[PDB]
Amino acid sequence: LLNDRVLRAMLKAEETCAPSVSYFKCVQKEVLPSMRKIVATWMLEVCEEQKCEEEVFPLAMNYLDRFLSLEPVKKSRLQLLGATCMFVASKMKETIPLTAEKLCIYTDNSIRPEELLQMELLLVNKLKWNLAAMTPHDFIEHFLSKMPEAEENKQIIRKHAQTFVALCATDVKFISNPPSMVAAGSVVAAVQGLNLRSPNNFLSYYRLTRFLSRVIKCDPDCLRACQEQIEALLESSLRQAQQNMD
C-alpha cells in the first residue's frame, strides 16, 4: 500500500536524524547525563503546564540530543538549548506555538527572548532544517492502525504508550533508540500490561514484539531489550514519586 512506501521512507528519514550514542564521551566536556535529566524534566513540566501537543517534548529532546551530538555546549548554556528545542518543536507541531517570552518566563527570566531567537538559528542550522522527522506518536498511530482492537481499547493504549514515550525521553536510552523503536517498545509494554489485567481483551499482545519489529525493520531482541528497559524505568519511578520529602 502507501503505508509501507511511506514507512520505508520514514524509517530512512529516521537514520538521518539519529543522535550519537557517545556524544557525552566524544563531544561534551561539561554536560553530563544527570544534567540532561534535569533539563528534560523541566522541559516536560513546561509541556505539561502549557498543555502542549504530546509530541512537543519528545521531539524537542530529539533536537537537543541531535545538537549535543554535533556541538560542544557549556552547561550554563544548556537550559537555553532545551528552551530553544521546545520553541522549534512547538512551532513544528502546534496550532498555537509557545511564545519566546513564555519560554523565558519559564526559566524565571534567566534567558531573554533575544538569546532564544539567536539559539533558534543555531539549532536549526546545525540540524540542517531537518525538523520534520517522524514522531513516536506517528509510529504508535501506525501500529494501532494495523491492530484489530476497538477504539476504546486503542484510546487506552495511546494514553499509556505516550506516558512511556515521555518517560524514555528523560532518560539516556532515548539517545541510542530510534523513535520507531521507542514507540514499538512503549506499545508492547502497554498492550502487554493491559491484556494482563484484562485477558481476552487486548489480544494483539501475542508475539507483538515479533509483529512490530517486522513493521519497524528491527532486531526483535533489541525491541524486547528496549521494552524491558522501558519497564525498568517505570519502576525506577517509584523513587521520584515518593522521595519528594527530604
Binding site: L2, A13, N125, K128, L131
Partner: protein
Amino acid sequence: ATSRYEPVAEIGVGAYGTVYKARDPHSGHFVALKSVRVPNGEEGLPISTVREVALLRRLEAFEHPNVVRLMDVCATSRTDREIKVTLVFEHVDQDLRTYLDKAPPPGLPAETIKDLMRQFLRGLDFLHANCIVHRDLKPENILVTSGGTVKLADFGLARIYSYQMALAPVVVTLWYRAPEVLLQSTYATPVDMWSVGCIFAEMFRRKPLFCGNSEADQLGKIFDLIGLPPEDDWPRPRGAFPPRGPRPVQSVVPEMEESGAQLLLEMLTFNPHKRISAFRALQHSYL
C-alpha cells in the same frame, strides 16, 4: 555567503532569483544554491516557512528519481526585519529547454516524448501525494543530466517565497499559469496539471503553446484554443469577452496523434475539477 560550499558559476535567474552552482568541498560534488529573504519577527523564523522547508528536507528520504533533493539549508544573515536563507539543492546539468533547444531532432521523437512525460507525471504524482504543489512548472524548472532522467526542480517554494515576491516582484512567464491562478489564485494541485499540458504540447512544437503576457492576455489566448466556457463553469476578474469556440486540437499541432490529442485536452480543461490528475493521466491510452 557564507556557506561551506564554493560557488563556481551562474545557472540562471528565475522568479526565485539568482541560482548559482557551487561545489561541496568535503563531498567533492556539485550544488545548486538559491536564496530567499524571509520575514523576521519577534517570534523568530516564520513557522510556515520553517515547516515548508523541513518537509522539503524530509522528502529526500523517499529517494524518488524524478525530483531534485534539498540537501541542506542555512540561515546566513540575520537582521531584525529579515533573515536570509540559502537553499542547497541537488545539481542537474541541463534544463528541459536546453534539451529541447539542442535538439538535432528536426521533428521528433514520440517515444522520447511519451517516456519523458511518463517521468514528468510520476515525479508530479509523487509531490502531489505528499501535498506538495509546484505552481511554477517551467521548462527551466524541469532538469535532466546525462541519462534522460528528468528531475523536477523548484517545487513547493511558492509559500517560502511569498514574502520576497511581494517586496520586489520580478519577471514572469505566464505561458504556463492555469486559468484559475490568473482569474483568481486557486493555488490548488490541478494547476500543475494545466502547466503539464502546455508542456506536453510545446514538446512537439518548439516554443510556448500559449505565449502571452497580460493575465487577460494569457486568458483569451487560452480561450482561443480551448474555447470560451459557457457557465456555470465560470468562477469569481472579468467579465465577458470574445465569445469563442472549441478549436480542434492541432491547428497548434501535429505532430500529435489520436489519443495524445485527447489527453492534452483533459490536461487543458478550464474546470480544475474535471481536469485530469497526474495519476489518471499517467495511465491514459497515450502513455
